[PDB]
């Protein structure tokens, strides 16, 4: 009884999360061919940290977490250790000691359309930066000015989430990208996710 890791369910999901509400799937007790993903022409970003992508088929991990969401092309650079900006600061934060791979591809053909796609949101305002792998789905009115908001959206009192409103004719930096982050867990425990 050897299970194939369900990476298809992650990369080929019909629906992707907004980055503020990023999805996590835990992958365990299974075999994966990472070489097939790494050697795929489908991905414009495949960047690994703490491990060599060429060795992945020879390693075992205690778990793999697959996080996925949509951001703009010009924000994919923020999905890396040690980065700053609205996405790394307020939406999805990798730790300095990250062991894992960041995978991205252009999704303009699925995630934009004539009239705009307003479904994908991001957090624009927050009182402090996210901790690594923190998810914030709260919607407290953000006080930007001197007047207390008392929970009321208005002048200098901001709802903290905004829509990308992806427009299909915008250039590549504005276009939606689907991102999958694979975190390779290294607990001092039996390692249940292996290569072939």
């Amino acid at each position, epitope marked *: 009884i050897t299970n194939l890791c369900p990476f298809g369910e992650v990369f080929n999901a019909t629906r992707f999360a907004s980055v503020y509400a990023w999805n996590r799937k835990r992958i365990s007790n299974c075999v994966a061919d990472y070489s097939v993903l790494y050697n795929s022409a489908s991905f414009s970003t495949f960047k690994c940290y703490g491990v060599s992508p060429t060795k992945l088929n020879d390693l075992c991990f205690t778990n793999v977490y697959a996080d996925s969401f949509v951001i703009r092309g010009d924000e994919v650079r923020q999905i890396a250790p040690g980065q700053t900006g609205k996405i790394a600061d307020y939406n999805y934060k990798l730790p300095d000691d990250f062991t894992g791979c960041v995978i991205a591809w252009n999704s303009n053909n699925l995630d934009s359309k004539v*009239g705009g796609n307003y479904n994908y949101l991001y957090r624009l305002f927050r009182k402090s930066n996210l901790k690594p792998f923190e998810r914030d789905i709260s919607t407290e009115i953000y006080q930007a000015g001197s007047t207390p908001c008392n929970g009321v959206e208005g002048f200098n*009192c901001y709802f903290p989430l905004q*829509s990308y409103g992806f427009q299909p004719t915008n250039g590549v930096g504005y276009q939606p990208y689907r991102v999958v982050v694979l975190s390779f867990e290294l607990l001092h425990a039996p390692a249940t996710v292996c290569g072939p």
Partner: nanobody, 121 residues
Framework: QVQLVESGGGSVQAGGSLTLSCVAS????????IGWFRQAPGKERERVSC????????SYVESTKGRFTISSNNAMNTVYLQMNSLKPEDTAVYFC??????????????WGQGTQVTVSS
């Protein structure tokens, strides 16, 4: 602070077309309602069109439906009013107006200086 930078408008012949642009600064489009009002000679300032930049949903008044289409490009912080099938009675000062909520039905808070549109018969 918030500024609405308006451009476009001027003189056009009846049945012609114009495009007004409104660029917001000091705010990022993607949450708030933003739209167009106009004031024609002898008439009170009135609603023309509005778009919710949170969800792209547009709203119109009886006189503007079909001929005018409001659109946003949130990444460009720009909204557009494409004015087609223009008539002399469309002659007015057109104002970009930005809300402090997501709802088009709410009252505008920030106003542009306005742009003259003159339609000749």
């Amino acid at each position: 602070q918030v500024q609405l930078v308006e451009s476009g408008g001027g003189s056009v012949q009846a049945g012609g077309s114009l495009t007004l642009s409104c660029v917001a600064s000091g705010v990022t489009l993607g949450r708030h309602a933003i739209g167009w009002f106009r004031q024609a000679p002898g008439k009170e300032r009135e609603r023309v069109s509005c778009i919710r930049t949170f969800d792209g949903i547009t709203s119109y008044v009886e006189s503007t439906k079909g001929r005018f289409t409001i659109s946003s490009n949130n990444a460009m912080n720009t909204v557009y009013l494409q004015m087609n099938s223009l008539k002399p009675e469309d002659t007015a000062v057109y104002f970009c107006a930005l809300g402090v909520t997501a709802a088009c039905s709410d009252n505008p808070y920030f106003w542009g200086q306005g742009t003259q549109v003159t339609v000749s018969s």
